[PDB]
Amino acid sequence: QPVQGMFENFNIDGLFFPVVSFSAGIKVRFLLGGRHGEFKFLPPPGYA
């Protein structure tokens, strides 16, 4: 389900990367796609 909120018009001078911040008592798993972690949903068209 999509969220009805969206960032835009931010600085693109630098380089971007995924990031997760956590405090404690947290167990999560990255799914980067393909051989590393299989996506649970089809990516939006055009996105890689």
Backbone atoms as SQL, in Angstrom:
CREATE TABLE atoms (id INTEGER PRIMARY KEY, chain TEXT, resi INTEGER, resn TEXT, atom TEXT, x REAL, y REAL, z REAL);
INSERT INTO atoms VALUES
  (1, 'A', 1, 'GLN', 'N', 0.827, -1.195, 0.000),
  (2, 'A', 1, 'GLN', 'CA', 0.000, 0.000, 0.000),
  (3, 'A', 1, 'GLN', 'C', 0.865, 1.249, 0.000),
  (4, 'A', 2, 'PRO', 'N', 0.628, 2.186, -0.914),
  (5, 'A', 2, 'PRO', 'CA', 1.415, 3.422, -0.923),
  (6, 'A', 2, 'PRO', 'C', 1.029, 4.340, 0.225),
  (7, 'A', 3, 'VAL', 'N', 1.966, 5.209, 0.594),
  (8, 'A', 3, 'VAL', 'CA', 1.742, 6.232, 1.610),
  (9, 'A', 3, 'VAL', 'C', 1.382, 7.534, 0.912),
  (10, 'A', 4, 'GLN', 'N', 0.502, 8.317, 1.532),
  (11, 'A', 4, 'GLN', 'CA', 0.034, 9.568, 0.936),
  (12, 'A', 4, 'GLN', 'C', 0.911, 10.738, 1.390),
  (13, 'A', 5, 'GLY', 'N', 2.217, 10.517, 1.289),
  (14, 'A', 5, 'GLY', 'CA', 3.200, 11.532, 1.611),
  (15, 'A', 5, 'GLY', 'C', 4.492, 11.214, 0.900),
  (16, 'A', 6, 'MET', 'N', 5.211, 12.272, 0.541),
  (17, 'A', 6, 'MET', 'CA', 6.250, 12.108, -0.462),
  (18, 'A', 6, 'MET', 'C', 7.256, 13.246, -0.374),
  (19, 'A', 7, 'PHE', 'N', 8.535, 12.888, -0.276),
  (20, 'A', 7, 'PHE', 'CA', 9.624, 13.857, -0.317),
  (21, 'A', 7, 'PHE', 'C', 9.929, 14.218, -1.762),
  (22, 'A', 8, 'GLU', 'N', 10.382, 15.450, -1.977),
  (23, 'A', 8, 'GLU', 'CA', 10.845, 15.847, -3.299),
  (24, 'A', 8, 'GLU', 'C', 11.687, 17.113, -3.195),
  (25, 'A', 9, 'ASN', 'N', 12.228, 17.519, -4.346),
  (26, 'A', 9, 'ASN', 'CA', 12.930, 18.794, -4.506),
  (27, 'A', 9, 'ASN', 'C', 14.049, 18.962, -3.481),
  (28, 'A', 10, 'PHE', 'N', 14.764, 17.876, -3.211),
  (29, 'A', 10, 'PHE', 'CA', 15.870, 17.901, -2.270),
  (30, 'A', 10, 'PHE', 'C', 17.194, 18.014, -3.020),
  (31, 'A', 11, 'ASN', 'N', 18.270, 18.210, -2.262),
  (32, 'A', 11, 'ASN', 'CA', 19.590, 18.356, -2.859),
  (33, 'A', 11, 'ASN', 'C', 20.037, 17.050, -3.501),
  (34, 'A', 12, 'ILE', 'N', 20.641, 17.161, -4.682),
  (35, 'A', 12, 'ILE', 'CA', 21.139, 16.001, -5.410),
  (36, 'A', 12, 'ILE', 'C', 22.627, 16.182, -5.675),
  (37, 'A', 13, 'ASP', 'N', 23.268, 17.053, -4.894),
  (38, 'A', 13, 'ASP', 'CA', 24.696, 17.303, -5.074),
  (39, 'A', 13, 'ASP', 'C', 25.525, 16.072, -4.731),
  (40, 'A', 14, 'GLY', 'N', 25.187, 15.391, -3.640),
  (41, 'A', 14, 'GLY', 'CA', 25.947, 14.254, -3.165),
  (42, 'A', 14, 'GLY', 'C', 25.447, 12.935, -3.714),
  (43, 'A', 15, 'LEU', 'N', 25.796, 11.864, -3.007),
  (44, 'A', 15, 'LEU', 'CA', 25.420, 10.509, -3.379),
  (45, 'A', 15, 'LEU', 'C', 24.455, 9.945, -2.345),
  (46, 'A', 16, 'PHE', 'N', 23.523, 9.118, -2.806),
  (47, 'A', 16, 'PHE', 'CA', 22.482, 8.548, -1.967),
  (48, 'A', 16, 'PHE', 'C', 22.745, 7.068, -1.718),
  (49, 'A', 17, 'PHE', 'N', 22.117, 6.549, -0.665),
  (50, 'A', 17, 'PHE', 'CA', 22.233, 5.142, -0.307),
  (51, 'A', 17, 'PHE', 'C', 21.095, 4.788, 0.636),
  (52, 'A', 18, 'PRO', 'N', 20.645, 3.536, 0.642),
  (53, 'A', 18, 'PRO', 'CA', 19.651, 3.117, 1.634),
  (54, 'A', 18, 'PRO', 'C', 20.228, 3.179, 3.038),
  (55, 'A', 19, 'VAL', 'N', 19.349, 3.387, 4.015),
  (56, 'A', 19, 'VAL', 'CA', 19.788, 3.532, 5.398),
  (57, 'A', 19, 'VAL', 'C', 18.646, 3.124, 6.317),
  (58, 'A', 20, 'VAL', 'N', 19.003, 2.473, 7.422),
  (59, 'A', 20, 'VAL', 'CA', 18.057, 2.114, 8.472),
  (60, 'A', 20, 'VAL', 'C', 18.664, 2.474, 9.818),
  (61, 'A', 21, 'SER', 'N', 17.916, 3.224, 10.620),
  (62, 'A', 21, 'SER', 'CA', 18.327, 3.596, 11.965),
  (63, 'A', 21, 'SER', 'C', 17.462, 2.856, 12.974),
  (64, 'A', 22, 'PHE', 'N', 18.103, 2.279, 13.988),
  (65, 'A', 22, 'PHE', 'CA', 17.404, 1.489, 14.989),
  (66, 'A', 22, 'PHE', 'C', 18.037, 1.706, 16.355),
  (67, 'A', 23, 'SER', 'N', 17.218, 1.552, 17.394),
  (68, 'A', 23, 'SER', 'CA', 17.655, 1.761, 18.771),
  (69, 'A', 23, 'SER', 'C', 18.089, 0.464, 19.446),
  (70, 'A', 24, 'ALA', 'N', 17.168, -0.485, 19.597),
  (71, 'A', 24, 'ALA', 'CA', 17.412, -1.751, 20.279),
  (72, 'A', 24, 'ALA', 'C', 16.151, -2.594, 20.172),
  (73, 'A', 25, 'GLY', 'N', 16.302, -3.890, 20.425),
  (74, 'A', 25, 'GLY', 'CA', 15.175, -4.803, 20.310),
  (75, 'A', 25, 'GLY', 'C', 14.574, -4.821, 18.923),
  (76, 'A', 26, 'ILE', 'N', 15.417, -4.737, 17.898),
  (77, 'A', 26, 'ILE', 'CA', 14.977, -4.597, 16.518),
  (78, 'A', 26, 'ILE', 'C', 15.736, -5.591, 15.652),
  (79, 'A', 27, 'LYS', 'N', 14.992, -6.377, 14.878),
  (80, 'A', 27, 'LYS', 'CA', 15.543, -7.347, 13.940),
  (81, 'A', 27, 'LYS', 'C', 14.891, -7.085, 12.590),
  (82, 'A', 28, 'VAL', 'N', 15.670, -6.604, 11.621),
  (83, 'A', 28, 'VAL', 'CA', 15.136, -6.300, 10.300),
  (84, 'A', 28, 'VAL', 'C', 16.033, -6.942, 9.251),
  (85, 'A', 29, 'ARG', 'N', 15.553, -6.944, 8.008),
  (86, 'A', 29, 'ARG', 'CA', 16.284, -7.565, 6.912),
  (87, 'A', 29, 'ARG', 'C', 16.156, -6.715, 5.659),
  (88, 'A', 30, 'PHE', 'N', 17.308, -6.321, 5.118),
  (89, 'A', 30, 'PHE', 'CA', 17.383, -5.708, 3.801),
  (90, 'A', 30, 'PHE', 'C', 17.059, -6.720, 2.712),
  (91, 'A', 31, 'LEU', 'N', 16.266, -6.270, 1.738),
  (92, 'A', 31, 'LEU', 'CA', 15.979, -6.967, 0.490),
  (93, 'A', 31, 'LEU', 'C', 16.401, -6.007, -0.619),
  (94, 'A', 32, 'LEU', 'N', 17.635, -6.158, -1.099),
  (95, 'A', 32, 'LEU', 'CA', 18.140, -5.302, -2.164),
  (96, 'A', 32, 'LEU', 'C', 17.769, -5.801, -3.551),
  (97, 'A', 33, 'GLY', 'N', 17.233, -7.014, -3.657),
  (98, 'A', 33, 'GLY', 'CA', 16.812, -7.543, -4.937),
  (99, 'A', 33, 'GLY', 'C', 17.703, -8.650, -5.458),
  (100, 'A', 34, 'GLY', 'N', 17.160, -9.468, -6.352),
  (101, 'A', 34, 'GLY', 'CA', 17.965, -10.451, -7.057),
  (102, 'A', 34, 'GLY', 'C', 18.610, -11.462, -6.128),
  (103, 'A', 35, 'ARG', 'N', 19.929, -11.612, -6.269),
  (104, 'A', 35, 'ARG', 'CA', 20.643, -12.681, -5.582),
  (105, 'A', 35, 'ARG', 'C', 20.766, -12.430, -4.085),
  (106, 'A', 36, 'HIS', 'N', 20.584, -11.190, -3.637),
  (107, 'A', 36, 'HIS', 'CA', 20.826, -10.881, -2.231),
  (108, 'A', 36, 'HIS', 'C', 19.560, -11.040, -1.397),
  (109, 'A', 37, 'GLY', 'N', 18.495, -10.332, -1.759),
  (110, 'A', 37, 'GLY', 'CA', 17.224, -10.516, -1.088),
  (111, 'A', 37, 'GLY', 'C', 16.044, -10.347, -2.019),
  (112, 'A', 38, 'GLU', 'N', 15.202, -11.371, -2.122),
  (113, 'A', 38, 'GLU', 'CA', 14.102, -11.354, -3.076),
  (114, 'A', 38, 'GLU', 'C', 13.025, -10.373, -2.632),
  (115, 'A', 39, 'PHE', 'N', 12.562, -9.548, -3.568),
  (116, 'A', 39, 'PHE', 'CA', 11.508, -8.590, -3.272),
  (117, 'A', 39, 'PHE', 'C', 10.189, -9.302, -2.996),
  (118, 'A', 40, 'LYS', 'N', 9.422, -8.747, -2.061),
  (119, 'A', 40, 'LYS', 'CA', 8.088, -9.254, -1.771),
  (120, 'A', 40, 'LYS', 'C', 7.020, -8.652, -2.670),
  (121, 'A', 41, 'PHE', 'N', 7.342, -7.584, -3.397),
  (122, 'A', 41, 'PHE', 'CA', 6.397, -6.929, -4.285),
  (123, 'A', 41, 'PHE', 'C', 7.120, -6.485, -5.548),
  (124, 'A', 42, 'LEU', 'N', 6.370, -6.397, -6.638),
  (125, 'A', 42, 'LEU', 'CA', 6.947, -5.966, -7.904),
  (126, 'A', 42, 'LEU', 'C', 7.346, -4.497, -7.814),
  (127, 'A', 43, 'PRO', 'N', 8.573, -4.140, -8.186),
  (128, 'A', 43, 'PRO', 'CA', 8.969, -2.738, -8.135),
  (129, 'A', 43, 'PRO', 'C', 8.148, -1.916, -9.108),
  (130, 'A', 44, 'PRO', 'N', 7.958, -0.628, -8.823),
  (131, 'A', 44, 'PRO', 'CA', 7.240, 0.222, -9.767),
  (132, 'A', 44, 'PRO', 'C', 7.966, 0.283, -11.086),
  (133, 'A', 45, 'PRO', 'N', 7.239, 0.447, -12.194),
  (134, 'A', 45, 'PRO', 'CA', 7.883, 0.435, -13.512),
  (135, 'A', 45, 'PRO', 'C', 8.944, 1.519, -13.628),
  (136, 'A', 46, 'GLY', 'N', 10.048, 1.170, -14.277),
  (137, 'A', 46, 'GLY', 'CA', 11.181, 2.061, -14.445),
  (138, 'A', 46, 'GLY', 'C', 12.217, 1.971, -13.344),
  (139, 'A', 47, 'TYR', 'N', 11.778, 1.731, -12.112),
  (140, 'A', 47, 'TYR', 'CA', 12.701, 1.663, -10.989),
  (141, 'A', 47, 'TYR', 'C', 13.566, 0.410, -11.075),
  (142, 'A', 48, 'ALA', 'N', 14.807, 0.537, -10.608),
  (143, 'A', 48, 'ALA', 'CA', 15.769, -0.548, -10.667),
  (144, 'A', 48, 'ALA', 'C', 16.102, -1.049, -9.267);
